[PDB]
Amino acid sequence: MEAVPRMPMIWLDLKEAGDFHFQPAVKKFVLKNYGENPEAYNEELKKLELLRQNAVRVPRDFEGCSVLRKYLGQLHYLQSRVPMGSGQEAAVPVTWTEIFSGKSVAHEDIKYEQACILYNLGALHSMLGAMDKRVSEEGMKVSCTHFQCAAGAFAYLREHFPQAYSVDMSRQILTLNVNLMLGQAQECLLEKSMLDNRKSFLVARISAQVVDYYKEACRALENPDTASLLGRIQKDWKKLVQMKIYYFAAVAHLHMGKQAEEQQKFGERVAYFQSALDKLNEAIKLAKGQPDTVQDALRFTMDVIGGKYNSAKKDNDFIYHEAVPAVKGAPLVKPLPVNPTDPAVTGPDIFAKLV
């Protein structure tokens, strides 16, 4: 199973930005409250304006993540010196497009700009995670890291910002995203654990945790209001996620059977391999119409599991004659921290001189 074709991954689209005309409000505030020439900070203001322009047209690459993190941090630095939050003196309209409806949503609140940038950091990480083939050591590692980073961004958004500036960033939707991203990180970890020839004991537990994350994502996708918001996207995601629940359950029980093989409990071995084959057959039914990438993974796994089940039953029936009978998850991935105000990720405070 170390050589199994890779399943495709889900990613999220980036949100589209509208206007955030901070410059005139900053100048008014500098003149009225800092008592200084309103044109004394034009270099700082142009540097921030250029950074926003870069962030809202971010390249879909690892450098783009750094741009979003830098801009997110500089918005925190600006807010610490000029009050542009809800109801505050220097607040100006912030407009972004809600991604599922295509409608513009405006709030006079710099933290809404921060929220959308952080969302896009999560979305970009999900894209980068889903782009690699996951066949190289560096590619498997970075894909896992990307999905952990995506989970961390959506979780930070959920916990540290006003709730539901727009419905694409509501707590329930962000929780779906976090679970999906952790499930995909755990799937990347499973692939690596099999290439590293970890103990069947551990591989089964890792795969069981993949199932656990995807089951929670599936539960969320079945919620009628989530299904309504995501529309046809919910149909697409649910088909892939529901198939993966059975696929990785089969992978877990395959490795439980291999543990029985190692412990010379050849009756248990047959029972786990039979359960694995039954779960994989359900995954194959659920994969009707899925792309060739999905079909290739399932066919490869059918060759492994079907052949192991057959040989295990033959060995039991004619050699060992053991009774055939009738898994706790290992969460080893976590959302990785955003650290929005660490100077190593933000660089120097653009407005350090405004004091």
Numbering used by the authors: 1 to 326, 333 to 361
Sentences from the paper on this structure:
A central feature of HD-PTP function is the ability of its Bro1 domain to recruit CHMP4, the major subunit of the ESCRT-III membrane remodeling protein complex (Doyotte et al., 2008, Ichioka et al., 2007, Parkinson et al., 2015). Crystallographic structures of the HD-PTPBro1 domain in complex with the relevant binding regions of SARA, endofin, and all three human CHMP4 isoforms reveal that SARA and endofin binding is similar to that of CHMP4 at the conserved site, but critically extends into a neighboring specific pocket unique to HD-PTP.
For the CHMP4 peptides only 11 residues are clearly visible in the electron density maps, whereas 20 residues are visible for the SARA and endofin peptides. All three CHMP4 peptides bind in the same way across helices H5, H6, and H7 of HD-PTPBro1, and form similar van der Waals contacts with a number of conserved residues, including the critical L202/I206 pair. The main CHMP4 anchoring residues are a Leu and a Trp present in all three isoforms (L217 and W220 in CHMP4A and CHMP4B, L228/W231 in CHMP4C), which contact HD-PTPBro1 residues L189, L202, and I206 from two hydrophobic pockets between H5 and H6 and H6 and H7. Thus, binding of CHMP4A/B/C to HD-PTPBro1 requires rearrangement of these side chains to accommodate the critical CHMP4 Leu and Trp residues.
